[PDB]
Each structure stands twice: as C-alpha cells, then as structure tokens.
Inverse folding.
C-alpha cells in the first residue's frame, strides 16, 4: 500500500508511486526522475497518465516501452494545468531530467515536492522566489551534520588532473569509470574531453545516454571500445578481479588501469580533503573512490530550508526508523529557531 508521504492532499495525485498497483483515487501519477527506487512498476502495460520532464519521458518510452499516449511531458519553469490544478516543474540539480514539483492547491495551499535534489543557491532565483510554500516534501538523504562533501566542480578538477597526469606519464594506461544508473555523466565526459578520447560503452548504456538531450553527445560517446581510452563499466565490475579481467580483453593495447568509483558519501569525508584522496592499488590497477554527490550536503539542505521557510516539513528519505525520524525532527526545529520563522 502507498505510504502517506507519496500522496499530495487535496488532489488526485501521487509522486513516485508505481510499485503499489492501482492507487485508490489516483487520477495522475507524477515521476520526479528515472532512478529505479522511483520508477519501480512502470512498463508497456501501464495505462494511467504519467506526468514528467521531457528527458524522463524519452527514457520511459525507449527503455521501459511505456506507450506514448500515456506519457505527458511538461516543459520546465512553465505554469501548466493538470486535472484542474496548476503545477510547475523545476530543475532539481540531481541526474538528467530530474525535477522538483510545485503544486498550487485549489484552497490556496502551495506544496513543493523536491523529489531527489542537490540544493543550490541558484534555486533561490527560480519561480520559488515569487510565493510562500506551506508544505515541503524534502529529500533528507544526508540530513545529519557529519555529511560534508566538496563541490562537484572540485571533484571533477581532481579527476581530470589525476587522469591527465596518469595517461601523460603512461600512454598505455586505460581509464575506467563505474556506472549503474543515469547521473554523474560529468565524471566520464570531463576525463574523456581532457584526454581527447570518446567514452566507450555497451550498446544498452549508449541507448540510455542518447535519450538525455545532452548537446554534442554524438561527439563524446561511442560503442567502439577499440577506439576509446576511457571505458564505462557496471559499478559491480570496479574491483581488482573485474578490472584484471577487463584488461585481458583489451588484447595487449594497455598495461595499466586507473579506475574511478563515484560514490555518494563515505566516512573518509570526515577526516580527509579532496586534495588528499589516494587510491587502492594492486599491481598495475589503481581504484579511486571519489565523493561526487547528486544529493544535498547537510549545510546545503539547511540553507535551502532556512531560505524557503516552510510551515511544515515531510521527509521522504530515512523515514523507516524512529531514531532517524527523531534526529531529523530535532534538526528541523533547530533550523526554525535559528532563522526565526
Ligand atoms: Ni535519485
């Protein structure tokens, strides 16, 4: 059964609610982004209206085979009417196609559902600036002060400098990057760009990237592994065994691998700066875990909420334990007392 925090009161709507069968009284199903914990349940057999971004709709149609007549893509930053209710989709600074959803209820209540997001000050000058929000359904993934991580720009700087140094010292080194879903494309695209290479990948991953409206993508990616010195592999293969095995398949073209695992947060964040990150090495294979996050840090989250000043917060992440829930509620009260709302 659908949980309460996926239902939008006063409407016929749900958010990211496809794994519960036919939801009682739901007249339109919103999907914030194409990640499997959110889309779980969609297929060619779905016959209700799905509302989403253009990019998310390209992925629904091509990867899951949802029929076109049930996909309702909306432009961003544009007031739209859905079953008699005004809605706006806003960029979530998550993965490609990811949105937040503003709902203007008939009674005057305004609700913002962040989906998954990485809060940014640029959001303080979207259509959010123009009215009060009463209720916030918040991505609380990293809602605790231990979660610090660097900007995306610093992490990409580190990766590009590390890759360009390694390959310049050894023109026979291969760079490998791990992936298991959309998001974090900048990692592999920035490395390929500095090395003057395309990114080589499976046909299935190339199909996924072609759904994303990224400019000049035919210029940056390829299925010809032989012509590429940056390869993408499933995240599961980014270990010493999987990478040794890959290097065998390359037929003596390469004699070293430098691999990157973009993770979210790991506890090495609490002690070490990005400058200071070092790999795990075995033989001719080095693996770097880099803290490239597509979710808010604690401080970024705090800043957004203190700016927005909602009347009520509904967390959407870490809701399954009483200790998590209590911890999050204590932070929300601190933020409200410190800022004065
Ligand atoms: Ni996500």
């Amino acid at each position: 059964t659908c949980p309460f925090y996926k239902k939008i009161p006063g409407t016929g709507f749900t958010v990211d609610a496809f794994q519960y069968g036919v939801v009682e009284g739901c007249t339109a199903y919103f999907l914030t982004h194409f990640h499997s914990d959110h889309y779980a349940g969609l297929s060619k057999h779905f016959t209700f209206p799905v509302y989403c971004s253009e990019i998310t709709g390209n992925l629904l149609k091509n990867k899951l085979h949802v029929q076109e007549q049930y996909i309702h893509p909306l432009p961003l930053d544009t007031e739209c009417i859905v079953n008699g209710v005004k809605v706006v989709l806003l960029d979530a600074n998550h993965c490609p196609g990811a949105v937040m959803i503003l709902f203007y209820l008939p009674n005057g209540t305004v609700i913002l559902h962040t989906g998954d997001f990485r809060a940014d000050p640029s959001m303080e000058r979207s259509l959010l600036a123009d009215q009060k929000v009463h209720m916030l359904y918040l991505d609380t993934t990293y809602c605790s002060p231990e979660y610090t991580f660097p900007s995306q720009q610093e992490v990409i700087r580190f990766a590009i400098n590390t890759a360009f140094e390694a390959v310049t010292l050894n023109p026979h080194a291969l760079v490998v990057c791990g992936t298991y879903s959309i998001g974090k494309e900048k990692v592999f695209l920035a490395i390929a760009d500095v090395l003057g290479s395309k990114v080589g990948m499976s046909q299935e991953k190339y199909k996924t990237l072609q759904c994303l409206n990224i400019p000049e993508i035919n210029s940056l990616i390829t299925t010809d592994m032989c012509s590429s010195l940056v390869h993408l592999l499933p995240m599961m293969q980014i270990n010493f065994k999987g990478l040794q095995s890959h290097l065998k398949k390359c037929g003596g073209k390469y004699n070293q691998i430098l691999a990157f695992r973009p993770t979210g947060w790991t506890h090495s964040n609490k002690f070490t700066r990005i400058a200071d990150v070092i790999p795990q090495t075995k033989g001719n294979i080095s693996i770097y875990g880099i803290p490239y996050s597509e979710h808010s840090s604690y401080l970024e989250m705090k800043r957004f909420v203190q700016w927005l000043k909602p009347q009520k917060i509904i967390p959407t992440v870490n809701v399954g334990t009483w200790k998590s829930r209590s911890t999050m509620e204590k932070y929300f009260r601190e933020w409200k007392l410190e800022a004065g709302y």
About this structure: The first strand starts at residue 7 and ends at 8. Residues 33, 35, 94, 116 surround nickel (II) ion (CB under 6 Å). The chain has nine helices and 18 strands.
